[PDB]
Write a protein that binds this DNA or RNA. Structure first.
Ligand SMILES: [Mg+2]
Ligand SMILES: [Mg+2]
Ligand SMILES: [Mg+2]
Ligand SMILES: [Mg+2]
Ligand SMILES: [Mg+2]
Ligand SMILES: [Mg+2]
Lengths: 72, 175, 58, 51, 109, 40
RNA sequence: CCAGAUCUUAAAGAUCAAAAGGAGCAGGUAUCAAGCACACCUAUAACGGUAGCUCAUAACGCCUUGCUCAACCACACCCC
């Protein structure tokens, strides 16, 4: 009966958790790896604007904070 | 803040005959002094509906309900001050602040002058519901902040580059 | 009449009516109150209609 | 000619309305009497109890 | 006799959406459109800016727009003609009396 | 569902077919690598 | 809605019709959700003044594509 659907899920979940334990630190890399792409693409997004709006420098008092890498 | 004075003689006893001759003990018993809080809220209700309204009798009047609701809100706010952890009553307050806004939108569509005067009296302000409810998140708030400042700059630069042209062409026209 | 804007407002005015805005700036006002649905239709047809002959011609 | 005919219709109907509304006013006064009587009675009762 | 506008908009009525500009009203128009699958009529909306001398339009007003003969800007092709219902103050076209909703404020007699 | 829903979602479109192994062409010219055998 | 080109002709007709527009209709995808000055006001006569505009009725993207066919749109070695 419908348990037979749940069994599949139950297994697929278990078999996933196990995986994410072994793979943990590999995972941890690739997460942060993409956060450093994010923050960069983000930056370029704004850089694009100065250069598109004709300004040479980034406007006064702009440090362009890091949102994605926010921790603690 | 208003203050329904300690001696105010609970509402249901206000208009009955032969009160003031009565001795100070019983007066003390029927005072707001010995009252529940519900009583004080009946009073606040009365006073507010006298100051604000036209026809004290109409309950169904859109105005009336706005005033009454406002009284109860003001109460939920004090109860909110003293209990900050109480989620239930936070819910009531925030539903109610809203419903009041609903009926205010009704006044503003239907009878304008009246709506106006109520907003004046009860210190309620009507802020039109802004289109597009979107959760502003860090990425967006930041990119907008930047853009706003880029604008604020390019209009400055345009201003100066045209200002030196004003100065140059005027200094050539003068001599 | 696919080119004629038809708008509808609810409960603004305590008595029901039609309005009509013509090319001239002529404002027609048709009071429909205890009228039958059919009566409104035929009344409108009367006021700004087209003669049957007009249509047939076209 | 048409517009004037329309005008006429509006006039006549307007009148019918006026008559109706007058009727409703008489009805409203009768009601107001009934209301005032019941309100007065309960005012009596409440006053009694309080005193 | 030539004064024209190439735009089909020639006369419309819409709500007044926003006041945010000087002497220019943001007015939303709504026409019925027949959805061909369902064969039903739905409200399609379109916004028009309009020009105002008095800057007289509150938000929420039912307003009559007249096409302008020569367009002011890309986005302004209209002039507010008459206010059909000023919001919150509405005087019944029939009887010429002040009203709110179903109720007259000052009745006949 | 309801009519407003059927309006907002439009009528259903019949999804374009996913091209198979031949990538849409009737046949393909090909060059042999290794002849071999498979089990059913 | 028509500038212009051409044709006819005793100056006004006619055929194409650029640009510019907008009632409405118009490929997939929302895992593309915000775009980033995209508005207006002054008729002063190119300067000033406001702080706006678009967008969940799908803006801004990305992907695929001639077409609604007495025809229409587009290209003409590539760098629109
Ligand atoms: Mg499995
Ligand atoms: Mg990743
Ligand atoms: Mg209590
Ligand atoms: Mg053309
Ligand atoms: Mg995906
Ligand atoms: Mg400027």
């Amino acid at each position: 009966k419908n348990i037979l659907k749940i069994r599949r899920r139950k297994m697929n979940h278990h078999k996933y958790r196990k995986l994410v334990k072994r793979t943990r630190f590999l995972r941890r890399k690739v997460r942060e790896g993409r956060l450093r792409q994010k923050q960069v693409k983000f930056e370029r997004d704004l850089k694009r604007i100065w250069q598109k709006a004709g300004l040479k420098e980034a406007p006064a008092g702009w440090q362009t904070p890091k949102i994605y890498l926010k921790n603690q | 803040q208003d203050d329904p004075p300690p001696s105010m003689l609970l509402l249901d006893y206000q208009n009955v005959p032969g009160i003031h001759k009565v001795d100070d003990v019983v007066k003390r018993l029927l005072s707001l002094e010995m009252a529940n809080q519900k009583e004080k809220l009946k009073i606040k209700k009365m006073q507010l509906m006298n100051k604000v309204l036209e026809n004290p009798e109409d309950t169904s009047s859109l105005e009336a309900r706005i005033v009454a609701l406002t009284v109860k809100i003001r109460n939920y706010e004090e109860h909110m001050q003293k209990h900050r952890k109480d989620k239930a009553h936070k819910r009531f307050l925030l539903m109610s602040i809203d419903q009041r806004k609903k009926m205010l939108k009704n006044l503003r569509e239907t009878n304008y002058a009246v709506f106006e005067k109520i907003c004046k009296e009860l210190g309620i302000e009507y802020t039109f519901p802004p289109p597009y409810h979107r959760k502003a998140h860090r990425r967006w708030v930041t990119k907008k902040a930047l853009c706003t400042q880029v604008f604020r700059e390019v209009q400055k630069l345009k201003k100066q580059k045209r200002a030196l042209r004003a100065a140059a062409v005027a200094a050539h026209k003068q001599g | 009449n696919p080119w004629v804007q038809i708008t509808m407002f609810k409960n603004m005015t305590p008595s029901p009516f039609l309005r009509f805005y013509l090319d001239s700036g002529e404002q027609v006002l048709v009071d429909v109150e205890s009228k039958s649905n059919k009566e409104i239709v035929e009344h409108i047809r009367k006021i700004l209609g087209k003669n049957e002959e007009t249509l047939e011609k076209e | 000619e048409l517009m004037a005919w329309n005008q006429a219709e509006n006039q006549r109907l307007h009148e019918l309305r006026l008559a109706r509304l007058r009727q409703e006013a008489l009805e409203q006064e009768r009601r107001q009497a009934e209301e005032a009587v019941l309100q007065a009675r309960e005012a009596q009762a409440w006053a009694q109890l309080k005193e | 006799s030539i004064a024209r506008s190439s735009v089909h908009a020639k006369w419309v009525v819409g709500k007044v959406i926003g006041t945010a500009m000087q002497k220019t009203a943001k007015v939303r128009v709504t026409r019925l459109v027949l959805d061909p699958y369902l064969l039903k009529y739905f409200n399609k909306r379109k916004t028009y800016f309009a020009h105002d001398a008095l800057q007289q339009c509150t938000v929420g007003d039912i307003v009559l727009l007249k096409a302008l003969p020569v367009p002011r800007t890309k986005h302004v092709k209209h002039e507010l003609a008459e206010i059909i219902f000023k919001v919150g103050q509405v005087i019944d076209p029939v009887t010429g009396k002040p009203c709110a909703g179903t109720t007259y404020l000052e009745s006949p007699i | 569902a309801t009519l407003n829903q059927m309006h907002r979602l439009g009528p259903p479109k019949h999804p374009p077919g996913k091209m198979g192994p031949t990538a849409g062409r009737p046949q393909l010219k090909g060059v042999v690598l290794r002849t071999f055998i498979r089990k059913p």
